[PDB]
């Protein structure tokens, strides 16, 4: 408790200085060369690039400014860049550079060579509890960090977790992250992962991330999420019902932890009580977890990637840059 308090107070000082004075326009597209397209997002693509001068590799997220305004995602995109450039933690993807041109926003991000946890999870089916526990522990520590900065993440799911060269997790995509004291209201995130108070238009706080952790651990350990259906509105009905069925292979400790994370009552949800994150860290399902060893990356990982590509292939298309500046006013602080 005594040193964790001073760790977090120094981390908050570091964060606030960058939050109040964000880095802006720290690179240009011509400094980078495309290797391959890594995936696609709501407003554009993610590409693996090499820095021509240094040789370093990065993931470059490209956002079409016109698609962002049209999807009314301007403030979320501004949130995303300002927050991600200001945070620093072992399990968060770093935002190394950002810039814009006439058509697009560019976020040059730390590259995770192991690819998407989503791909690995779907391919193998489900993770063992020890393997799921190893990843869950990194999310617990990351949320403890982020929440101490008054940040809510709001989009925890396998799709947003990457595997690095050591087999550890990196949280990518701050597209819905938000700095708020108190409560917020935006219906956003992914249906399967939405806490009930998001659906019920009640206002909500950082406790929604602890709920999403429950959904994540369940999906890693079961191979499917606790609430699924063909259409989002049927998913929402199961979420507010407050009924979870567990596979028979789930341990009692796992079921107990999940009942306390997938807790509809905010005054009872783990992570939201007087002891905060310590109710999670001291839960019996985490009995084998050395929390400091996880933070220091001294624990053996469930699997190590092998760099040479069993990653997904995408068609390579040109990055179109209009001769006329688009949406300049909306994105002036980016």
């Amino acid at each position: 408790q005594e040193s964790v308090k001073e760790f977090l107070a120094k981390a908050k000082e570091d964060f606030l200085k960058k939050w109040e004075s964000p880095a802006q326009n720290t690179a240009h597209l011509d400094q980078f060369e495309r290797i391959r397209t890594l995936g696609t997002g709501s407003f554009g693509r993610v590409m693996l690039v090499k820095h021509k001068e240094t040789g370093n590799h990065y993931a470059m997220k490209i956002l079409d400014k016109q698609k962002v305004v049209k999807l009314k995602q301007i403030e979320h995109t501004l949130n995303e860049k300002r927050i991600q450039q200001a945070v620093n933690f072992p399990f968060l993807v770093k935002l190394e550079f950002s810039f814009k041109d006439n058509s697009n926003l560019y976020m040059v991000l730390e590259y995770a060579p192991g690819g998407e946890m989503f791909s690995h999870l779907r391919r193998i089916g489900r993770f063992s509890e020890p393997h799921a526990r190893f990843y869950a522990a990194q999310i617990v520590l990351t949320f403890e960090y982020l929440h101490s900065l008054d940040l809510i993440y709001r989009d925890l799911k396998p799709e947003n977790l990457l595997i690095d060269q050591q087999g550890y997790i990196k949280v990518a995509d701050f597209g819905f992250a938000k700095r708020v004291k108190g409560r917020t209201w935006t219906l956003c995130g992914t249906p399967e992962y939405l806490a009930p108070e998001i659906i019920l238009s009640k206002g909500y706080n950082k406790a929604v991330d602890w709920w999403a952790l429950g959904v994540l651990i369940y999906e890693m350990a079961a191979g499917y999420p606790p609430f699924f259906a063909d259409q989002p509105i049927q998913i929402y009905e199961k979420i507010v019902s407050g009924k979870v069925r567990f596979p028979s292979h789930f341990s009692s400790d796992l079921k107990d932890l999940l009942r306390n994370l997938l807790q509809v009552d905010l005054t009872k949800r783990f992570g939201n009580l007087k002891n905060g994150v310590n109710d999670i860290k001291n839960h019996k399902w985490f009995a084998t977890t050395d929390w400091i060893a996880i933070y220091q990356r001294k624990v053996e990982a469930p699997f190590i990637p092998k760099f040479k590509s069993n990653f997904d292939d995408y068609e390579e298309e040109e990055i179109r840059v209009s001769i006329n500046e688009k949406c300049g006013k909306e994105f002036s602080e980016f």
Binding site: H76, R122, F176, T186, C188, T190, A229
Partner: peptide, 20 residues
């Protein structure tokens, strides 16, 4: 099985987040 029902659903690929 629950797993078969999931695999037969339309929501086993990368899931879009709702913006609104």
């Amino acid at each position: 099985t629950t797993y078969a029902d999931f695999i037969a659903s339309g929501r086993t690929g990368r899931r879009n987040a709702i913006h609104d």
